[PDB]
Amino acid sequence: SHMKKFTCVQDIGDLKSALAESFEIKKDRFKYVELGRNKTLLMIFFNSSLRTRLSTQKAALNLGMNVIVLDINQGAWKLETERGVIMDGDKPEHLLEAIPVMGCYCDIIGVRSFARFENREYDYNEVIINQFIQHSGRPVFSMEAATRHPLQSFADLITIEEYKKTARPKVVMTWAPHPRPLPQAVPNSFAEWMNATDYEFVITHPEGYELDPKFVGNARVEYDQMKAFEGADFIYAKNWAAYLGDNYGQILSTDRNWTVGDRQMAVTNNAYFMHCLPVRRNMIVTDDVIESPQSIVIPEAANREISATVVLKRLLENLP
Amino acid sequence: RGSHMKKFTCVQDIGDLKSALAESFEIKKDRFKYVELGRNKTLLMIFFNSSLRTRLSTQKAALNLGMNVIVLDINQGAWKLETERGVIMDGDKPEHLLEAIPVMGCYCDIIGVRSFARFENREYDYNEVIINQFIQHSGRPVFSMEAATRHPLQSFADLITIEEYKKTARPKVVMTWAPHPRPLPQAVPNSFAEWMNATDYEFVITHPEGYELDPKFVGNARVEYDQMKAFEGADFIYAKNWAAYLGDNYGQILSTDRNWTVGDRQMAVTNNAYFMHCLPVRRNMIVTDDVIESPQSIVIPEAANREISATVVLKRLLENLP
Amino acid sequence: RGSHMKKFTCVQDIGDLKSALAESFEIKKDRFKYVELGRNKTLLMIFFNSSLRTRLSTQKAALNLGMNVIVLDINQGAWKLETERGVIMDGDKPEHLLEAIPVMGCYCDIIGVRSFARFENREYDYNEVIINQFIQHSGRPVFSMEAATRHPLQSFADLITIEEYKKTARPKVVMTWAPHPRPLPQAVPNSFAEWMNATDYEFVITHPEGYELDPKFVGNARVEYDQMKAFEGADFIYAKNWAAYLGDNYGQILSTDRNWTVGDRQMAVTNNAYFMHCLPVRRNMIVTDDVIESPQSIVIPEAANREISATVVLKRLLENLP
Numbered sequence: 001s002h003m004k005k006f007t008c009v010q011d012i013g014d015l016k017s018a019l020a021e022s023f024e025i026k027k028d029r030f031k032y033v034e035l036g037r038n039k040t041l042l043m044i045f046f047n048s049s050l051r052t053r054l055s056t057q058k059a060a061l062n063l064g065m066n067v068i069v070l071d072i073n074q075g076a077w078k079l080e081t082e083r084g085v086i087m088d089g090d091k092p093e094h095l096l097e098a099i100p101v102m103g104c105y106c107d108i109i110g111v112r113s114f115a116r117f118e119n120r121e122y123d124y125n126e127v128i129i130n131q132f133i134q135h136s137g138r139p140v141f142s143m144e145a146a147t148r149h150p151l152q153s154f155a156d157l158i159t160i161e162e163y164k165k166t167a168r169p170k171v172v173m174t175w176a177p178h179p180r181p182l183p184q185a186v187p188n189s190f191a192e193w194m195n196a197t198d199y200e201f202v203i204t205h206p207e208g209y210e211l212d213p214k215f216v217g218n219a220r221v222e223y224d225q226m227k228a229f230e231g232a233d234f235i236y237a238k239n240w241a242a243y244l245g246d247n248y249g250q251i252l253s254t255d256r257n258w259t260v261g262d263r264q265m266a267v268t269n270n271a272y273f274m275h276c277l278p279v280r281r282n283m284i285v286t287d288d289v290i291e292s293p294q295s296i297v298i299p300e301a302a303n304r305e306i307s308a309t310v311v312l313k314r315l316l317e318n319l320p
Numbered sequence: 321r322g323s324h325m326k327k328f329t330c331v332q333d334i335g336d337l338k339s340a341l342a343e344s345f346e347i348k349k350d351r352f353k354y355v356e357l358g359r360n361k362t363l364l365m366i367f368f369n370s371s372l373r374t375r376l377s378t379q380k381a382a383l384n385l386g387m388n389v390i391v392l393d394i395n396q397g398a399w400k401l402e403t404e405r406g407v408i409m410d411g412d413k414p415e416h417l418l419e420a421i422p423v424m425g426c427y428c429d430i431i432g433v434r435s436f437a438r439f440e441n442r443e444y445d446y447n448e449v450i451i452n453q454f455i456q457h458s459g460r461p462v463f464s465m466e467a468a469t470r471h472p473l474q475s476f477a478d479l480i481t482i483e484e485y486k487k488t489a490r491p492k493v494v495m496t497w498a499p500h501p502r503p504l505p506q507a508v509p510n511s512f513a514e515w516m517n518a519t520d521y522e523f524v525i526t527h528p529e530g531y532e533l534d535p536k537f538v539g540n541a542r543v544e545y546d547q548m549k550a551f552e553g554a555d556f557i558y559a560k561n562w563a564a565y566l567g568d569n570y571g572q573i574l575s576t577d578r579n580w581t582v583g584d585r586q587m588a589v590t591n592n593a594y595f596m597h598c599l600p601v602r603r604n605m606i607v608t609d610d611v612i613e614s615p616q617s618i619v620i621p622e623a624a625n626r627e628i629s630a631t632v633v634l635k636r637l638l639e640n641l642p
Numbered sequence: 643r644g645s646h647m648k649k650f651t652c653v654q655d656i657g658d659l660k661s662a663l664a665e666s667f668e669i670k671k672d673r674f675k676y677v678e679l680g681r682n683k684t685l686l687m688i689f690f691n692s693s694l695r696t697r698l699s700t701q702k703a704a705l706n707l708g709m710n711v712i713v714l715d716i717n718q719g720a721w722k723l724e725t726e727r728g729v730i731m732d733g734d735k736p737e738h739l740l741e742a743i744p745v746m747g748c749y750c751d752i753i754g755v756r757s758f759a760r761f762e763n764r765e766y767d768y769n770e771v772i773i774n775q776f777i778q779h780s781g782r783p784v785f786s787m788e789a790a791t792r793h794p795l796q797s798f799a800d801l802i803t804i805e806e807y808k809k810t811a812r813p814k815v816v817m818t819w820a821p822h823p824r825p826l827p828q829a830v831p832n833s834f835a836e837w838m839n840a841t842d843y844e845f846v847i848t849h850p851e852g853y854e855l856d857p858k859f860v861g862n863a864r865v866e867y868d869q870m871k872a873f874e875g876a877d878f879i880y881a882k883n884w885a886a887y888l889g890d891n892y893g894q895i896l897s898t899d900r901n902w903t904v905g906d907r908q909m910a911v912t913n914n915a916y917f918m919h920c921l922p923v924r925r926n927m928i929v930t931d932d933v934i935e936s937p938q939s940i941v942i943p944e945a946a947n948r949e950i951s952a953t954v955v956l957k958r959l960l961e962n963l964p
C-alpha cells in the first residue's frame with residue numbers, strides 16, 4: 001500500500017495479497033503499462049548480473065516506465081565509499097555526491113551491492129544500500145544487497161506457491177560446495193521469507209556454516225543433509241561463505257558430498273529442485289538433477305520478472 | 321514461407337526475395353509505418369563479440385517497430401558462460417550456457433545473438449552449435465547477428481543495396497578476398513555467397529589458392545584464382561577477408577599478400593564497379609584509401625541498409641509471434 | 643540563431659541567453675511539457691570517456707522530449723577506432739573513424755559526443771578535430787558532451803543555476819583553480835569562462851602562476867593570481883582543476899599546492915558565496931569536506947540543472963530537424 005522501499009520481506013506486507021498481485025500480473029503482464037508512463041527507473045550495478053539485470057528492465061517495461069541501466073566502474077567514475085578521506089588517488093568521485101546526483105535524474109532506484117566481506121559489521125549494517133535510501137531522495141529497492149535479496153526470494157515464494165502439491169510443503173534449503181566465497185544474502189533472504197510462511201522450513205549445511213540468527217529464526221537446522229532432505233517437497237540449494245566470527249567471508253569446506261545429486265533427491269518426496277542462479281553445474285548440483293523434470297530452475301527465474309513487476313508497481317503507486 | 325518466419329539465420333528464412341525486397345524499399349521510404357506493430361514487444365540483443373553496426377542498426381530497427389530494446393553484453397555485465405556440458409564447473413565460469421539461454425528467453429519476445437566462429441573446432445562452428453542452442457532452448461524466435469558461418473542480416477542489406485544501385489538486371493558481382501592481420505571467420509563470405517547464389521546475378525568469387533570456402537556456400541558460383549581476371553567488367557566489388565577453411569588450415573592465415581588489397585589497379589579493370597564492404601574495414605589492407613573514399617564506394621549507403629534489413633526481419637518475426 | 647540550432651558545441655549556438663534561460667525555467671516547471679516533440683526521433687550518445695552526469699542527465703533529457711535513446715560506449719562494445727588518416731591499419735584498430743562517424747550517423751537523428759582532450763597535441767585538441775569530424779561527416783546535428791576544449795552542456799547548466807540562486811542582478815562569480823593528482827582538460831574552465839564572459843556578471847578567474855588559459859576563452863575576464871583576493875566579496879565560487887595550457891607545459895601538472903584547496907579559510911572572505919563544481923570532485927583536494935557539505939554548496943542543485951540544459955538543447959535541435 002504505502003511502499004517507500006523494498007529491501008526485506010517486511011516491505012511487501014501481507015503475503016496473501018502480494019501473491020494475489022503476482023498471479024494477476026502473470027495473467028495480464030501489461031495490465032498496468034500506463035502506470036509508469038513518464039516515470040524513470042535507474043538501475044545501478046556494482047556487480048555482475050544476468051537475471052536481475054534483464055528481468056528488472058522487462059519488469060519496468062511491463063509498467064510503461066523509462067529504464068536507465070548504469071554500470072558504475074564500467075561507464076562512470078570509481079566511487080570513494082569512506083568519508084573524510086583525502087581523495088588523492090584511485091577514486092575520482094565520492095559516493096556522497098554520486099548518490100544524490102543519480103537521484104536527480106530518476107523516480108525510482110534499484111541498486112545491487114554485494115557484500116564486500118571486508119568488514120562483517122559494514123556489510124550487515126547494509127551501509128551502502130542504506131546510504132542510497134538516505135541520500136538518493138528516491139524510493140530505493142534492492143537488486144541484492146549485502147545481507148538480503150528480496151526480489152529473488154519473493155520470486156522463490158511465488159514459484160513454490162505455484163508448484164506446491166500441499167498447503168504447507170517441506171522446503172529444505174541446502175548448502176553446496178563452491179570454489180569461491182559467496183555472500184550469504186541469498187540464503188538469509190530465503191530463510192527470512194520461508195519463515196514468514198507456514199511451510200515446514202528446514203536449513204541444512206556443514207558444521208561451521210551457521211547463518212545469522214536474526215535470519216535463521218526458528219527454522220529447524222539439520223547438520224545431516226540426507227536427513228534434512230527426507231520427504232522434502234522443495235530443495236533450494238545455494239552456497240554461502242562462512243558467517244561466524246573468525247571465519248566471516250571464508251570458505252571452510254568444499255566437500256563434494258553436499259553437491260546436490262540424485263543420491264540426495266531420492267530420499268526426498270520427489271521434491272522439486274530450485275536455485276536462484278547462477279549455478280555451477282556439478283558443484284552445487286548434478287547435471288541430471290538440474291536437467292531432470294523436477295527441476296523448476298527456469299520457471300523460478302521467470303518469476304523474477306513478476307516479483308519485480310509487483311514491487312515496481314507498488315513503488316510507483318506510492319510515488320508523489 | 322516468408323510469412324512463417326520462425327527464425328533468421330540463413331537466406332531460406334526470408335522467403336521470396338522479390339517481396340522481401342519490396343518490403344525493404346517500402347520501409348526505406350516510410351521508416352515508422354509499422355511503429356505500432358511491436359508495441360509492448362521486447363527485443364533482447366546478446367553479444368558475445370564486439371559490434372558497432374549490428375549493435376546500432378538493430379536497436380534502431382527495433383524502435384522503428386515500436387519495440388522495447390534490451391542490449392546485453394555477456395562477459396561485460398553478466399557471468400562468463402560454460403559452453404561444454406558435463407564438465408565440473410569448479411573454475412572460471414559461474415554460469416552454464418544451458419541455464420543462461422532459457423533464462424534469457426524468459427524476459428523477451430525476440431532474441432538476437434551474435435556469436436563469432438571460435439575456430440577451436442571446425443565441426444562445432446559449422447554445425448552452429450551455439451546459435452542452434454539458442455534456437456532450441458530459448459523459447460523465442462532467434463535471429464543471427466552473425467553466427468559462426470553466416471550473417472544474413474548483413475547479406476540481406478547487401479542485396480538491398482545492390483538492388484538499389486545496380487544499373488542492369490543481372491550485374492556482375494565479384495566477391496574478393498583481401499589480406500588481413502588476424503584470422504577472420506568465413507561467415508560474411510559464406511553468407512554473401514549464399515545470398516548472391518539465390519539471385520540471378522552473375523556471381524564470381526576470387527581468392528588466393530587455399531582459401532576455398534565450404535562447398536555448401538560456394539554453390540555453383542564461378543571461382544577465379546586470378547583477382548585481375550575476376551574483376552574484369554565487374555559491376556560490384558564485395559571485398560572481405562576470411563581465414564583459411566580447408567583441412568588443416570581451419571581458422572588460419574595462409575598469407576597476407578598485399579597484391580590482393582583492393583586498389584585503383586584492380587578497380588580500373590572493372591566496369592566502373594561500385595565498391596562494397598560490410599565494415600569494419602582495415603584501410604590499406606583490405607581496400608586503398610583512394611578506392612574506399614572514391615565516389616564509387618557505397619560503403620556507407622550499404623551500412624545504412626543494415627537498418628532496413630533488420631527492420632524487415634524484426635517485422636516478419638513480430639508478425640509471426642503467438 | 644538559437645531558433646535555428648544546427649549543433650551545440652559552444653555558447654554562440656544557444657543564442658539569446660535571456661530566452662534560453664526562459665525555456666530552462668519553463669522546463670524545470672513542466673518537465674514533460676514537450677514529451678511529444680521528439681516522438682520517433684532517435685538520439686545517439688557516444689562516449690569515448692567515462693561519465694556519470696552527462697551519461698544519466700542526457701538520457702533523462704531525451705526521455706523528457708519522448709525521444710528514443712541509444713547509448714554507445716566505443717572501446718567497450720564497438721571496435722577500436724583509427725583516428726589518423728593514411729596509416730596502414732595493420733594492428734590495434736579494426737575500424738577507422740572515417741567510416742565509423744558516417745555509419746553512426748545512419749541510425750539516429752541527433753548525435754551527442756564526448757571526447758576528452760588527449761593532451762598528445764595541443765593544436766589537435768584545440769582545433770577540436772574529432773568533435774568537428776562528427777559535425778562534418780555524421781550527417782546529423784551534433785551536440786557536445788564535453789569536447790577537448792569546451793563543455794557547453796555543463797556551462798549552460800551553470801548559467802541556469804547561478805541565475806536560479808543569485809541574490810543580485812550581476813553577482814561576482816569567481817572561478818578558482820585547485821590541486822589535483824592527475825592532469826585534467828581545460829574544457830570545463832574554458833567553457834565556464836566562455837559562458838560567464840557572455841553575461842553581465844562580474845567575472846574573475848584565479849589560478850597559480852603558469853595556469854593561464856587560452857586568451858580566446860579568458861577574454862576580458864579579470865585574472866587574479868591571489869586566490870584570497872579574488873574570493874573577496876564573491877557571490878559564487880566555481881572551483882575546477884585543469885592542467886597547464888601554455889607553451890611547453892601543455893597537458894601537464896605544474897602544481898599540487900594544497901593552499902588552493904577551497905576550504906572554509908577562503909570561503910570566509912567571500913560574500914557568503916555559494917560553492918559550485920561541475921563534478922566529479924575529489925574531496926580534500928579541490929574542496930573541503932566542510933565547504934562542499936556546507937549549506938552554501940549548491941553542487942547538487944547544479945548537477946540537477948544538467949538535465950535542464952540538455953533538455954533545452956535537445957528541444958531546440960528537435961525543433962530544427964528537417
Ligand SMILES: CCC[C@H](NC(=O)CCC(=O)O)C(=O)O
Pocket residue numbers: 091092093824826827829830883920921922924
Ligand atoms: C565533467 C568533468 C570531467 C573531467 N574530470 C575528470 O576527468 C576527473 C577524473 C579524475 O578525478 O581523475 C574534466 O576535468 O574535464
Ligand SMILES: CCC[C@H](NC(=O)CCC(=O)O)C(=O)O
Pocket residue numbers: 144180182183184185186239276277278280413414415
Ligand atoms: C544471485 C546470486 C549472486 C551470488 N552468486 C555469485 O556471485 C556466484 C559467482 C560464481 O559462481 O563465481 C550470491 O551468492 O549472492
Ligand SMILES: CCC[C@H](NC(=O)CCC(=O)O)C(=O)O
Pocket residue numbers: 502504505507508561598599600602735736737
Ligand atoms: C562484420 C564483420 C565481423 C568480423 N570482423 C572482424 O572480426 C574484424 C576484426 C579486425 O579487423 O581485427 C568478421 O570478419 O566476421
